[model samples]
Target: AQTVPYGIPLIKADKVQAQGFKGANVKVAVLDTGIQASHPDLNVVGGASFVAGEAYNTDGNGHGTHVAGTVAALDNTTGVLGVAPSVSLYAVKVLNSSGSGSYSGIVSGIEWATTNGMDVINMSLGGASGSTAMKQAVDNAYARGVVVVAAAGNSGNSGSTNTIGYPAKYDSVIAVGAVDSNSNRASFSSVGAELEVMAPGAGVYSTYPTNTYATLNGTXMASPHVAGAAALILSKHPNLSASQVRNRLSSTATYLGSSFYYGKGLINVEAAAQ
Candidate 1:
């Protein structure tokens, strides 16, 4: 099983001070394992549990916690920092403790996020089957200007036929791949043309299941960098539609010229902040 590290999120956050997001009221809805909102470094709000018919959402597994922390953990005197300190988070625990979930659970999370007015929806889980319910839920969210981002999967290295997974495979969603410190595709990062962007992956450092730090790997790990990058952009330009933000991030990508596996390329938060 993959793990999490408690401290600065992946994607070289140390190089950038999360500025321009001081007072933005951006809301990020994380649809994964539940997040550990009680953490001192996390300022999560609107947290809810969509655990099938269960009563509440909690971070049974640390995947959601680390991903959520990466996107908005406060940039302060804590272990590491998030990409958008001022942003808020909404937790939708679709995945169970085993780090796996079904398509219906994911669709339910998307519907709930959209109905509740979440600006950004981040899904770090994927499965083989493509459900119409899931696609419709995502379409509804997209129509409402809610940006959806997804993982490219961990299968890795399938050559030309290694297509991206659903939701991420969907053009409407931003499919994020993973790259290492050297900016090359990580050996385990699943690749394909469906991939829209790439973020710092490899042996990434991030918040973990407990209050610990460790090197973790997965496309699940890379998605947050893109989410955080989008949050940074949205923090400054709150009025930009989800599509606009997506287009700008792709069009003005810092690593667009890098190898194609970098997908929209290595993200420069400084340039992205502009």
Candidate 2:
């Protein structure tokens, strides 16, 4: 079998694996660019693209593929493993080839994911400004029992500025920050009181476009770790509501520092087992 990425075990996903939670029954929506559906290490079940002219399953930019790999890369010997290996993945492509899309497009993607029965939505992209329509879509998804997770923006400062982005800044979404292998905050990871938790985001290894693998760094990488953890938790506690799951995560996280930088701190999947 392939070696699990450092992020897999750093969040205690491996320890949780021993307890037999594989997220087979969970459905995750990767609301990003797109995903390489044919990737050998991924379990992309289905998807739709909101970005015009792009197929939902093709990851030309490689961002969504990498994000998907972190959430549910298959538990095989081909490449790096994900946090929840068996989780069903959906490529809800909200962004285009340039990794850009309108808030309207994102909202539509959210609607699709919600109506199609997505248990989790991992939005690894964010913008500097907020939108009423966007927040409403996120709220609608949350109201329907979907666990929404997002990047806390990459425009970080000296741990003092609140550089958090939109949808993530909304209370309905869990904003994930970045931490290195040592669990130290990444200098580029945005910090704000709205931050919910920290996760392995620096130099993360996962699937890329065209059946390849690569390592990238961003809060984008961190969001899916928490998303996959949500799936793992759902695999065990299927009845835990979105807010409840959020509580379970924040409450069980490994404390790092002030709420400004770490929020509830780095998520602990094994500890969440209880």
Candidate 3:
């Protein structure tokens, strides 16, 4: 086996792999800037784009590639590894090069994943405001058993208030916050009642586009950790429902005293898989 990347070990993803759950056969859709399909570290099975005139096969902004890498960057010797390295990753490009897209585009991506039977959908993007259309799409996806995980926004305002952004704020999605390598809450990670869990996000290393790697920061980074954990849980218990997988993550996480900051707390993939 290849060396476990720093971030993956920090979050105990390597332990989950040792337990024989590397998210094999699970389908993960990353709805972000897009993915560099040709990146050697990734096993991108397929993808689609809601951004008109843009190719789904490329990650111009690099955010989607990083997010996808955190979820499943393939177990290999050369590049950074991921939490669930064997997952069937899909690049569902909703946002364009500028890292922004219409809510309609995001909804369309969710709809596409639902139709195609994707087991997990990772949304590392979020907005402060909520749209009825986006809410309906998330609700529909959860109802159909697709585990939707989203970022809790990077607007913590020094942890003063509940600032978890939309879609993440929606009850149907698992809202994830950022923690550092020391297990401390990231100052930039948004806190809120909607938060479902926390994961390593600050200065986390993962595969990047153009056959490279990067260390990034954001709840966007935190979201995929939980998404990967969800994939691990699903891989272990194929009979479990989406909600059940979500619950397992929160229930098994180590408590951090306050739900406002850490939700159920830091996710433990090994414990959740067990």
Top lDDT: which candidate number?
2
What tens digits encode model 3's per-residue C-alpha lDDT throughout 119-233? Answer: 9999999997989999999999999999999999999855367798989999999999998988999989898788889999899788788988888899999999999989988
lDDT of 1 by residue, 146-176 (tens): 8889988877756576557888878778888
lDDT of 3 at 120: 96
Residue 165 miss distance in model 1 (angstroms): 0.7
Native-to-model Cα distance after best TM-score fit, residue 34 in candidate 1, in Å: 0.3
lDDT of 1: 0.72
Kindly provide the TM-score of model 1 when superposed on the true structure, using C-alpha atoms. Answer: 0.89
lDDT of 2 by residue, 1-274 (tens): 5868899889999988778998887999999989989888887789998888999999889999999999988888789888999998899999998999999999999999999999999999999998889999999999999999999989986546689998899999999999999999998899888999999999999999988899999999999999999999999999899988889999999999998988999999988867
Per-candidate TM equals 0.89, 0.98, 0.97
TM-score top scorer: 2
- In model 2, the worst 10-residue window by lDDT is 153-162
Better of 1 and 3 by TM-score: 3
How much lDDT does each candidate structure score? 0.72, 0.92, 0.90
User: Which parts of model 2 are misplaced by more than 4 Å?
Assistant: none
Query: Which consecutive 10 residues in model 3 have the weakest lDDT in total?
Result: 1-10
lDDT of 2: 0.92
